[PDB]
């Protein structure tokens, strides 16, 4: 048949996080295990009342990892903050806590976003893929992460000082912009015409000095 009540520490009735077809993740109850095909799928009833039948890399434990289980390449779910709102989104651990990053984790989310995060804002995916980047759906992000992880600890970055004037790419074009803050391996950029800010990785090829170091 194929009706398990256990699979390792994945035990029906447990509480768990699950990835919804919106790409955000939500708490739920694991109500079933079904072998289908070569492997197993985990059925989540969400506290927000939907249901999904999910592969093991689209569920996560509802506890925070022990730092010192996480390493570069770890597949995680992490907290993103819209200000007051909090959301849960998948990503990759690009750095672990050190002195120069103020003992935080650098997360590269599957939509290309990047941010520093605490141990209490993380959740370990339950059954990640051997090559953990291989379930990143945006091809351009998967590739940046495969390159990054495979080259690590090689990590080219341009240096930047507050105030510095550079061009930063966005939606295919280059924009007059300004370096308005440095935090570790991230830099905050002000797009001038339009007044947006965002945090960008300093090894990112959207920064012109880094685009031009490399070509």
Using CB under 6 A as the criterion, which residues of the chain lie in contact with ligand FN9 when the complex forms?
Answer: 24, 80, 82, 85, 87, 89, 109, 111-113, 198, 200
Total Cβ atoms within 10 A of residue 13? 9
Among the listed residues 4, 7, 12, 26, the single contact to its own copies using CB under 8 A: 26
The two structure tokens encoding residue 162: 């507050």
Dist CA 2 CA 131 (whole Å): 27
Task: Check binding of 23 to its own copies (CB under 8 A).
Answer: yes
Angle (CA) 176-182-185 rounded to 5° is 105
Dist CA 211 CA 148 (whole Å): 16
Alpha helix positions (H), the chain: 139-151, 208-214
Beta bridge partners of 7: 10
Least distance between ligand FN9 and beta carbon 200 (Å): 6
Among the listed residues 2, 24, 67, 103, the single contact to its own copies using CB under 8 A: 24
- Site residues for its own copies, 84-103, by CB under 8 A, read 84-85
Instruction: Answer with the entry of ligand FN9, its own copies, none that 155 interacts with (C-beta below 5 to 8 A by kind).
Output: none
How many residues touch its own copies under the rule CB under 8 A: the total is 31
Least distance between ligand FN9 and beta carbon 115 (Å): 8
């Amino acid at each position: 048949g194929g009706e398990l009540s256990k699979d390792g520490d994945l035990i029906v009735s447990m509480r768990i996080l699950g990835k919804k077809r919106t790409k955000t993740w939500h708490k739920g109850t694991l109500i079933a295990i079904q072998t289908v095909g070569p492997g197993k799928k985990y059925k989540v009833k969400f506290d927000n009342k939907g249901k999904s039948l999910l592969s093991g890399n689209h569920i996560a434990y509802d506890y925070h990892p022990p730092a010192d289980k996480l390493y570069v390449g770890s597949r995680v779910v992490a907290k993103y903050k819209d200000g007051n709102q909090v959301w849960l989104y998948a990503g990759i651990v690009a750095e672990t806590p050190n002195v120069k990053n103020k003992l935080r984790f650098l997360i590269f989310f599957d939509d290309g976003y990047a941010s520093y995060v605490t141990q209490s804002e993380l959740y370990p995916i339950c059954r990640p893929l051997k090559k953990t980047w291989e379930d990143i759906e945006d091809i351009s992000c998967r590739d940046f992460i495969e390159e990054y992880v495979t080259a690590y600890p090689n990590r080219p970055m341009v240096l930047l000082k507050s105030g510095q004037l550079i061009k930063t790419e966005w939606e295919g074009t280059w924009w007059k912009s300004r370096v308005e803050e440095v935090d570790g391996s991230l830099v905050r950029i002000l797009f001038l015409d339009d007044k947006r800010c965002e945090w960008i990785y300093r090894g990112s090829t959207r920064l012109e000095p880094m685009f031009s170091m490399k070509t």
